[PDB]
Amino acid sequence: QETTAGSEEISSATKNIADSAQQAASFADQSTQLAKEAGDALKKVIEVTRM
Amino acid sequence: VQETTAGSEEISSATKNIADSAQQAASFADQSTQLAKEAGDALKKVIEVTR
Amino acid sequence: VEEGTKLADEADEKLNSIVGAVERINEMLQNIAAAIEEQTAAVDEITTAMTE
Amino acid sequence: VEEGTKLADEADEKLNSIVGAVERINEMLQNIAAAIEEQNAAVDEITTAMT
């Protein structure tokens, strides 16, 4: 009965982490894309500045 | 009971991996917020030059 | 200089959005941390119960 | 303008340090992805045992 209860909170925790992980992986992709725009605008402002 | 313990050993191994991977992910998240605050505070003192 | 000033404030806004984005990662990792703590206690009670 | 071009090239290198840090975050999130499928497999092995 104690093991059954522990295995329930292990199942629930695993699903909560699976959902949280899914979301955090999405945010990491969104973060690299804004580093693509931020670096594009900075390798062009250095080009305007040096001109 | 030996079988249950072997699955518990897999849970153990996986939960140590997630506890360490998440502590190291978080350690690069604070480095990424600090490098963001640095690159921003730098860039605004290039805006100080353009104005 | 005016076109380059708004282009500098284009990288600055994108960097401000990465702070936000990374703090969504941080909020998610903190939810995994609390879940792992509850799971770490549950795996303990099973590994004690199977040795018992 | 010479030292404004320099500060912007220092902010480039501090933005290339985020492009390295966010690559480490993605690898750490792939390390919890591989462990979350181990947790579900391990709890299927514990559930048939506790039953």
Side-chain angles (χ1 to χ4, degrees), chain C residues 8-50:
Chain C
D9 206 76
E10 163 65 33
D12 194 56
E13 64 181 272
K14 299 290 149 69
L15 286 166
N16 169 240
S17 300
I18 294 167
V19 177
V22 173
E23 288 302 322
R24 307 314 302 122
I25 304 172
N26 192 18
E27 186 175 303
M28 293 295 162
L29 293 169
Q30 289 171 39
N31 290 355
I32 297 169
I36 286 291
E37 183 172 294
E38 171 162 272
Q39 195 169 5
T40 298
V43 74
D44 188 81
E45 286 292 304
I46 300 182
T47 309
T48 310
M50 294 299 117

mmCIF file of all heavy atoms in Angstrom, chain C residues 8-50:
data_model
loop_
_atom_site.group_PDB
_atom_site.id
_atom_site.type_symbol
_atom_site.label_atom_id
_atom_site.label_comp_id
_atom_site.label_asym_id
_atom_site.label_seq_id
_atom_site.Cartn_x
_atom_site.Cartn_y
_atom_site.Cartn_z
ATOM 1 N N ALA C 8 20.376 49.769 -33.438
ATOM 2 C CA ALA C 8 20.943 49.396 -32.163
ATOM 3 C C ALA C 8 19.850 49.059 -31.158
ATOM 4 O O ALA C 8 19.914 48.043 -30.475
ATOM 5 C CB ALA C 8 21.822 50.548 -31.641
ATOM 6 N N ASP C 9 18.758 49.848 -31.113
ATOM 7 C CA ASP C 9 17.588 49.545 -30.312
ATOM 8 C C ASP C 9 16.707 48.402 -30.860
ATOM 9 O O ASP C 9 15.650 48.105 -30.309
ATOM 10 C CB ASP C 9 16.763 50.862 -30.222
ATOM 11 C CG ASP C 9 15.909 50.896 -28.980
ATOM 12 O OD1 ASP C 9 16.465 51.131 -27.874
ATOM 13 O OD2 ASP C 9 14.667 50.711 -29.058
ATOM 14 N N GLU C 10 17.108 47.741 -31.968
ATOM 15 C CA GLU C 10 16.514 46.518 -32.488
ATOM 16 C C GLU C 10 17.181 45.309 -31.864
ATOM 17 O O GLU C 10 16.535 44.324 -31.520
ATOM 18 C CB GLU C 10 16.653 46.480 -34.035
ATOM 19 C CG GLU C 10 16.453 45.117 -34.758
ATOM 20 C CD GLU C 10 15.070 44.494 -34.692
ATOM 21 O OE1 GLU C 10 14.050 45.227 -34.667
ATOM 22 O OE2 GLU C 10 14.997 43.234 -34.745
ATOM 23 N N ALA C 11 18.506 45.353 -31.634
ATOM 24 C CA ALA C 11 19.181 44.280 -30.939
ATOM 25 C C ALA C 11 18.873 44.306 -29.444
ATOM 26 O O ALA C 11 18.608 43.271 -28.841
ATOM 27 C CB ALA C 11 20.696 44.379 -31.203
ATOM 28 N N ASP C 12 18.797 45.504 -28.832
ATOM 29 C CA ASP C 12 18.461 45.717 -27.438
ATOM 30 C C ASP C 12 17.074 45.184 -27.054
ATOM 31 O O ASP C 12 16.896 44.589 -25.990
ATOM 32 C CB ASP C 12 18.593 47.236 -27.135
ATOM 33 C CG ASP C 12 18.586 47.514 -25.647
ATOM 34 O OD1 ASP C 12 19.431 46.953 -24.904
ATOM 35 O OD2 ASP C 12 17.703 48.282 -25.190
ATOM 36 N N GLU C 13 16.040 45.372 -27.909
ATOM 37 C CA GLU C 13 14.718 44.803 -27.677
ATOM 38 C C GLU C 13 14.680 43.282 -27.822
ATOM 39 O O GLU C 13 14.105 42.575 -26.994
ATOM 40 C CB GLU C 13 13.632 45.493 -28.546
ATOM 41 C CG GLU C 13 13.772 45.336 -30.079
ATOM 42 C CD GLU C 13 12.686 46.065 -30.847
ATOM 43 O OE1 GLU C 13 11.605 45.453 -31.071
ATOM 44 O OE2 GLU C 13 12.867 47.246 -31.244
ATOM 45 N N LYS C 14 15.377 42.719 -28.832
ATOM 46 C CA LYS C 14 15.555 41.286 -29.000
ATOM 47 C C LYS C 14 16.292 40.617 -27.835
ATOM 48 O O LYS C 14 15.937 39.521 -27.410
ATOM 49 C CB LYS C 14 16.159 40.946 -30.388
ATOM 50 C CG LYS C 14 15.281 41.397 -31.579
ATOM 51 C CD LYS C 14 13.983 40.589 -31.754
ATOM 52 C CE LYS C 14 12.806 41.384 -32.345
ATOM 53 N NZ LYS C 14 13.014 41.731 -33.755
ATOM 54 N N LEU C 15 17.317 41.284 -27.256
ATOM 55 C CA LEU C 15 18.025 40.845 -26.059
ATOM 56 C C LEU C 15 17.159 40.898 -24.809
ATOM 57 O O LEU C 15 17.204 39.992 -23.983
ATOM 58 C CB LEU C 15 19.287 41.715 -25.805
ATOM 59 C CG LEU C 15 20.469 41.448 -26.761
ATOM 60 C CD1 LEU C 15 21.500 42.583 -26.658
ATOM 61 C CD2 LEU C 15 21.147 40.101 -26.468
ATOM 62 N N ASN C 16 16.295 41.922 -24.665
ATOM 63 C CA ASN C 16 15.287 42.028 -23.616
ATOM 64 C C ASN C 16 14.282 40.869 -23.693
ATOM 65 O O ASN C 16 13.876 40.295 -22.682
ATOM 66 C CB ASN C 16 14.628 43.436 -23.729
ATOM 67 C CG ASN C 16 13.369 43.653 -22.893
ATOM 68 O OD1 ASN C 16 12.304 43.935 -23.445
ATOM 69 N ND2 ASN C 16 13.477 43.535 -21.559
ATOM 70 N N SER C 17 13.898 40.452 -24.912
ATOM 71 C CA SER C 17 13.048 39.285 -25.125
ATOM 72 C C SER C 17 13.719 37.953 -24.820
ATOM 73 O O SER C 17 13.040 36.991 -24.454
ATOM 74 C CB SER C 17 12.453 39.233 -26.545
ATOM 75 O OG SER C 17 11.666 40.398 -26.786
ATOM 76 N N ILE C 18 15.063 37.847 -24.943
ATOM 77 C CA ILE C 18 15.805 36.658 -24.527
ATOM 78 C C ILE C 18 15.848 36.537 -23.014
ATOM 79 O O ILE C 18 15.661 35.444 -22.488
ATOM 80 C CB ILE C 18 17.238 36.647 -25.082
ATOM 81 C CG1 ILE C 18 17.201 36.508 -26.620
ATOM 82 C CG2 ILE C 18 18.098 35.520 -24.460
ATOM 83 C CD1 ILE C 18 18.546 36.805 -27.292
ATOM 84 N N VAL C 19 15.962 37.656 -22.257
ATOM 85 C CA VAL C 19 15.851 37.661 -20.796
ATOM 86 C C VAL C 19 14.513 37.083 -20.360
ATOM 87 O O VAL C 19 14.447 36.159 -19.551
ATOM 88 C CB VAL C 19 16.055 39.049 -20.186
ATOM 89 C CG1 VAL C 19 15.867 39.020 -18.652
ATOM 90 C CG2 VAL C 19 17.476 39.544 -20.512
ATOM 91 N N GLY C 20 13.414 37.547 -20.998
ATOM 92 C CA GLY C 20 12.070 37.018 -20.797
ATOM 93 C C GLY C 20 11.945 35.551 -21.121
ATOM 94 O O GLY C 20 11.519 34.759 -20.285
ATOM 95 N N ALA C 21 12.381 35.139 -22.331
ATOM 96 C CA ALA C 21 12.421 33.755 -22.774
ATOM 97 C C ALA C 21 13.200 32.805 -21.851
ATOM 98 O O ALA C 21 12.730 31.726 -21.490
ATOM 99 C CB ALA C 21 12.944 33.672 -24.219
ATOM 100 N N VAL C 22 14.420 33.195 -21.427
ATOM 101 C CA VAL C 22 15.250 32.462 -20.477
ATOM 102 C C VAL C 22 14.611 32.392 -19.099
ATOM 103 O O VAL C 22 14.665 31.363 -18.423
ATOM 104 C CB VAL C 22 16.673 33.023 -20.417
ATOM 105 C CG1 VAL C 22 17.510 32.378 -19.291
ATOM 106 C CG2 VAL C 22 17.357 32.755 -21.773
ATOM 107 N N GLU C 23 13.905 33.446 -18.655
ATOM 108 C CA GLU C 23 13.142 33.380 -17.425
ATOM 109 C C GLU C 23 11.872 32.531 -17.524
ATOM 110 O O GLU C 23 11.322 32.126 -16.498
ATOM 111 C CB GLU C 23 12.799 34.798 -16.912
ATOM 112 C CG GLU C 23 14.025 35.554 -16.333
ATOM 113 C CD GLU C 23 14.705 34.834 -15.182
ATOM 114 O OE1 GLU C 23 14.005 34.213 -14.337
ATOM 115 O OE2 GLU C 23 15.958 34.910 -15.091
ATOM 116 N N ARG C 24 11.412 32.142 -18.737
ATOM 117 C CA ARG C 24 10.381 31.123 -18.873
ATOM 118 C C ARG C 24 10.996 29.738 -18.721
ATOM 119 O O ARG C 24 10.445 28.874 -18.044
ATOM 120 C CB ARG C 24 9.672 31.160 -20.258
ATOM 121 C CG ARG C 24 9.084 32.516 -20.718
ATOM 122 C CD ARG C 24 8.265 33.318 -19.699
ATOM 123 N NE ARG C 24 7.123 32.453 -19.247
ATOM 124 C CZ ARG C 24 6.903 32.109 -17.973
ATOM 125 N NH1 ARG C 24 7.532 32.687 -16.962
ATOM 126 N NH2 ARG C 24 6.032 31.139 -17.715
ATOM 127 N N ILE C 25 12.225 29.530 -19.252
ATOM 128 C CA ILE C 25 13.030 28.325 -19.041
ATOM 129 C C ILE C 25 13.308 28.124 -17.554
ATOM 130 O O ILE C 25 13.078 27.050 -17.003
ATOM 131 C CB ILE C 25 14.345 28.313 -19.831
ATOM 132 C CG1 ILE C 25 14.094 28.503 -21.344
ATOM 133 C CG2 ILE C 25 15.071 26.963 -19.596
ATOM 134 C CD1 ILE C 25 15.377 28.687 -22.165
ATOM 135 N N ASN C 26 13.776 29.182 -16.858
ATOM 136 C CA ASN C 26 14.040 29.197 -15.426
ATOM 137 C C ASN C 26 12.807 28.827 -14.586
ATOM 138 O O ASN C 26 12.885 27.987 -13.690
ATOM 139 C CB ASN C 26 14.571 30.615 -15.053
ATOM 140 C CG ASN C 26 15.173 30.698 -13.652
ATOM 141 O OD1 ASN C 26 15.519 29.691 -13.029
ATOM 142 N ND2 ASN C 26 15.285 31.934 -13.118
ATOM 143 N N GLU C 27 11.625 29.418 -14.869
ATOM 144 C CA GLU C 27 10.361 29.066 -14.227
ATOM 145 C C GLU C 27 9.930 27.610 -14.417
ATOM 146 O O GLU C 27 9.400 26.973 -13.505
ATOM 147 C CB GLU C 27 9.241 30.008 -14.733
ATOM 148 C CG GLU C 27 7.877 29.840 -14.019
ATOM 149 C CD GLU C 27 6.883 30.871 -14.499
ATOM 150 O OE1 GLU C 27 7.179 32.090 -14.392
ATOM 151 O OE2 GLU C 27 5.801 30.515 -15.037
ATOM 152 N N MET C 28 10.195 27.035 -15.605
ATOM 153 C CA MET C 28 9.939 25.639 -15.919
ATOM 154 C C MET C 28 10.903 24.709 -15.203
ATOM 155 O O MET C 28 10.479 23.712 -14.626
ATOM 156 C CB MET C 28 9.905 25.365 -17.440
ATOM 157 C CG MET C 28 8.706 26.029 -18.148
ATOM 158 S SD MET C 28 7.090 25.372 -17.635
ATOM 159 C CE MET C 28 6.156 26.792 -18.271
ATOM 160 N N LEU C 29 12.219 25.004 -15.186
ATOM 161 C CA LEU C 29 13.208 24.244 -14.428
ATOM 162 C C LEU C 29 12.929 24.238 -12.924
ATOM 163 O O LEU C 29 13.065 23.216 -12.257
ATOM 164 C CB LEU C 29 14.642 24.776 -14.664
ATOM 165 C CG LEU C 29 15.193 24.568 -16.090
ATOM 166 C CD1 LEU C 29 16.487 25.375 -16.267
ATOM 167 C CD2 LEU C 29 15.449 23.087 -16.406
ATOM 168 N N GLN C 30 12.465 25.369 -12.356
ATOM 169 C CA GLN C 30 12.026 25.452 -10.973
ATOM 170 C C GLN C 30 10.787 24.603 -10.662
ATOM 171 O O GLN C 30 10.631 24.104 -9.547
ATOM 172 C CB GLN C 30 11.760 26.923 -10.578
ATOM 173 C CG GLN C 30 13.039 27.781 -10.445
ATOM 174 C CD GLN C 30 12.678 29.259 -10.281
ATOM 175 O OE1 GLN C 30 11.713 29.624 -9.605
ATOM 176 N NE2 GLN C 30 13.459 30.148 -10.927
ATOM 177 N N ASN C 31 9.859 24.412 -11.624
ATOM 178 C CA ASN C 31 8.747 23.481 -11.451
ATOM 179 C C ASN C 31 9.205 22.024 -11.501
ATOM 180 O O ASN C 31 8.732 21.187 -10.729
ATOM 181 C CB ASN C 31 7.643 23.684 -12.529
ATOM 182 C CG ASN C 31 6.885 24.990 -12.319
ATOM 183 O OD1 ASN C 31 7.081 25.727 -11.353
ATOM 184 N ND2 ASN C 31 5.941 25.292 -13.240
ATOM 185 N N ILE C 32 10.178 21.678 -12.374
ATOM 186 C CA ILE C 32 10.805 20.359 -12.409
ATOM 187 C C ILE C 32 11.544 20.051 -11.117
ATOM 188 O O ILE C 32 11.486 18.938 -10.600
ATOM 189 C CB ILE C 32 11.745 20.212 -13.612
ATOM 190 C CG1 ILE C 32 10.938 20.333 -14.926
ATOM 191 C CG2 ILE C 32 12.577 18.908 -13.560
ATOM 192 C CD1 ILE C 32 11.806 20.462 -16.183
ATOM 193 N N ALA C 33 12.191 21.063 -10.507
ATOM 194 C CA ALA C 33 12.889 20.937 -9.247
ATOM 195 C C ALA C 33 11.998 20.525 -8.083
ATOM 196 O O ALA C 33 12.303 19.576 -7.363
ATOM 197 C CB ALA C 33 13.626 22.249 -8.931
ATOM 198 N N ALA C 34 10.854 21.210 -7.883
ATOM 199 C CA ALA C 34 9.856 20.823 -6.901
ATOM 200 C C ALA C 34 9.237 19.436 -7.130
ATOM 201 O O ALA C 34 9.036 18.659 -6.192
ATOM 202 C CB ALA C 34 8.768 21.906 -6.828
ATOM 203 N N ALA C 35 8.976 19.069 -8.405
ATOM 204 C CA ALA C 35 8.500 17.751 -8.783
ATOM 205 C C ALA C 35 9.517 16.651 -8.504
ATOM 206 O O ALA C 35 9.190 15.618 -7.922
ATOM 207 C CB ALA C 35 8.069 17.740 -10.258
ATOM 208 N N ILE C 36 10.808 16.894 -8.818
ATOM 209 C CA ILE C 36 11.916 16.007 -8.495
ATOM 210 C C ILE C 36 12.070 15.824 -6.995
ATOM 211 O O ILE C 36 12.318 14.715 -6.537
ATOM 212 C CB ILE C 36 13.229 16.492 -9.133
ATOM 213 C CG1 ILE C 36 13.226 16.214 -10.661
ATOM 214 C CG2 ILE C 36 14.491 15.874 -8.485
ATOM 215 C CD1 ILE C 36 13.306 14.730 -11.057
ATOM 216 N N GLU C 37 11.918 16.875 -6.162
ATOM 217 C CA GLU C 37 11.964 16.756 -4.709
ATOM 218 C C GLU C 37 10.866 15.841 -4.151
ATOM 219 O O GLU C 37 11.133 14.935 -3.353
ATOM 220 C CB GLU C 37 11.871 18.171 -4.067
ATOM 221 C CG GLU C 37 11.995 18.178 -2.522
ATOM 222 C CD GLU C 37 12.086 19.567 -1.918
ATOM 223 O OE1 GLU C 37 13.095 20.275 -2.169
ATOM 224 O OE2 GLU C 37 11.171 19.959 -1.140
ATOM 225 N N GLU C 38 9.618 15.980 -4.647
ATOM 226 C CA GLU C 38 8.516 15.098 -4.277
ATOM 227 C C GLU C 38 8.704 13.650 -4.757
ATOM 228 O O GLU C 38 8.423 12.680 -4.042
ATOM 229 C CB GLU C 38 7.198 15.696 -4.841
ATOM 230 C CG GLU C 38 5.961 14.771 -4.736
ATOM 231 C CD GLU C 38 4.643 15.505 -4.884
ATOM 232 O OE1 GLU C 38 4.095 16.007 -3.865
ATOM 233 O OE2 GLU C 38 4.055 15.508 -5.995
ATOM 234 N N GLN C 39 9.242 13.477 -5.981
ATOM 235 C CA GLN C 39 9.615 12.200 -6.557
ATOM 236 C C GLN C 39 10.790 11.519 -5.866
ATOM 237 O O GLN C 39 10.838 10.298 -5.760
ATOM 238 C CB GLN C 39 9.933 12.384 -8.061
ATOM 239 C CG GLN C 39 9.983 11.048 -8.837
ATOM 240 C CD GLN C 39 10.029 11.251 -10.351
ATOM 241 O OE1 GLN C 39 10.124 12.352 -10.888
ATOM 242 N NE2 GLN C 39 9.934 10.118 -11.085
ATOM 243 N N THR C 40 11.774 12.298 -5.379
ATOM 244 C CA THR C 40 12.953 11.827 -4.645
ATOM 245 C C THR C 40 12.570 11.250 -3.300
ATOM 246 O O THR C 40 13.088 10.211 -2.880
ATOM 247 C CB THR C 40 13.978 12.933 -4.427
ATOM 248 O OG1 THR C 40 14.450 13.398 -5.683
ATOM 249 C CG2 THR C 40 15.226 12.409 -3.706
ATOM 250 N N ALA C 41 11.578 11.867 -2.630
ATOM 251 C CA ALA C 41 10.982 11.339 -1.421
ATOM 252 C C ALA C 41 10.170 10.065 -1.669
ATOM 253 O O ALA C 41 10.243 9.100 -0.910
ATOM 254 C CB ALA C 41 10.100 12.424 -0.779
ATOM 255 N N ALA C 42 9.364 10.017 -2.751
ATOM 256 C CA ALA C 42 8.635 8.810 -3.105
ATOM 257 C C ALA C 42 9.503 7.595 -3.477
ATOM 258 O O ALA C 42 9.266 6.491 -2.995
ATOM 259 C CB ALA C 42 7.668 9.143 -4.256
ATOM 260 N N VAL C 43 10.592 7.764 -4.260
ATOM 261 C CA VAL C 43 11.547 6.707 -4.598
ATOM 262 C C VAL C 43 12.298 6.169 -3.381
ATOM 263 O O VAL C 43 12.638 4.984 -3.297
ATOM 264 C CB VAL C 43 12.454 7.027 -5.789
ATOM 265 C CG1 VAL C 43 13.539 8.056 -5.439
ATOM 266 C CG2 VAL C 43 13.085 5.732 -6.348
ATOM 267 N N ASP C 44 12.586 7.046 -2.391
ATOM 268 C CA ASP C 44 13.163 6.683 -1.112
ATOM 269 C C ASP C 44 12.268 5.704 -0.365
ATOM 270 O O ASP C 44 12.687 4.583 -0.070
ATOM 271 C CB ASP C 44 13.364 7.989 -0.291
ATOM 272 C CG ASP C 44 14.141 7.793 0.988
ATOM 273 O OD1 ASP C 44 15.398 7.737 0.945
ATOM 274 O OD2 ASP C 44 13.526 7.748 2.082
ATOM 275 N N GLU C 45 10.992 6.065 -0.121
ATOM 276 C CA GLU C 45 10.047 5.177 0.531
ATOM 277 C C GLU C 45 9.787 3.840 -0.149
ATOM 278 O O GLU C 45 9.576 2.843 0.536
ATOM 279 C CB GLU C 45 8.694 5.901 0.701
ATOM 280 C CG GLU C 45 8.724 6.974 1.806
ATOM 281 C CD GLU C 45 8.869 6.334 3.164
ATOM 282 O OE1 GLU C 45 8.037 5.460 3.533
ATOM 283 O OE2 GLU C 45 9.803 6.690 3.926
ATOM 284 N N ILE C 46 9.886 3.742 -1.492
ATOM 285 C CA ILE C 46 9.866 2.468 -2.199
ATOM 286 C C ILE C 46 11.141 1.675 -1.983
ATOM 287 O O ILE C 46 11.116 0.473 -1.733
ATOM 288 C CB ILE C 46 9.603 2.629 -3.701
ATOM 289 C CG1 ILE C 46 8.224 3.308 -3.896
ATOM 290 C CG2 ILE C 46 9.703 1.277 -4.447
ATOM 291 C CD1 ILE C 46 7.825 3.470 -5.365
ATOM 292 N N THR C 47 12.321 2.320 -2.088
ATOM 293 C CA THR C 47 13.596 1.608 -1.941
ATOM 294 C C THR C 47 13.830 1.132 -0.511
ATOM 295 O O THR C 47 14.427 0.080 -0.264
ATOM 296 C CB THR C 47 14.783 2.469 -2.372
ATOM 297 O OG1 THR C 47 14.565 3.018 -3.670
ATOM 298 C CG2 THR C 47 16.090 1.670 -2.433
ATOM 299 N N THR C 48 13.244 1.841 0.476
ATOM 300 C CA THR C 48 13.201 1.384 1.859
ATOM 301 C C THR C 48 12.218 0.244 2.023
ATOM 302 O O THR C 48 12.550 -0.792 2.588
ATOM 303 C CB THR C 48 12.856 2.493 2.849
ATOM 304 O OG1 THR C 48 13.675 3.640 2.639
ATOM 305 C CG2 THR C 48 13.175 2.013 4.272
ATOM 306 N N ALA C 49 10.994 0.369 1.467
ATOM 307 C CA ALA C 49 9.970 -0.655 1.506
ATOM 308 C C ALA C 49 10.303 -1.965 0.799
ATOM 309 O O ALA C 49 9.819 -3.029 1.174
ATOM 310 C CB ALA C 49 8.686 -0.084 0.870
ATOM 311 N N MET C 50 11.132 -1.941 -0.259
ATOM 312 C CA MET C 50 11.570 -3.158 -0.918
ATOM 313 C C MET C 50 12.723 -3.817 -0.194
ATOM 314 O O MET C 50 12.828 -5.041 -0.179
ATOM 315 C CB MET C 50 11.933 -2.946 -2.404
ATOM 316 C CG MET C 50 10.736 -2.572 -3.297
ATOM 317 S SD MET C 50 9.436 -3.846 -3.351
ATOM 318 C CE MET C 50 8.177 -2.777 -2.610
#
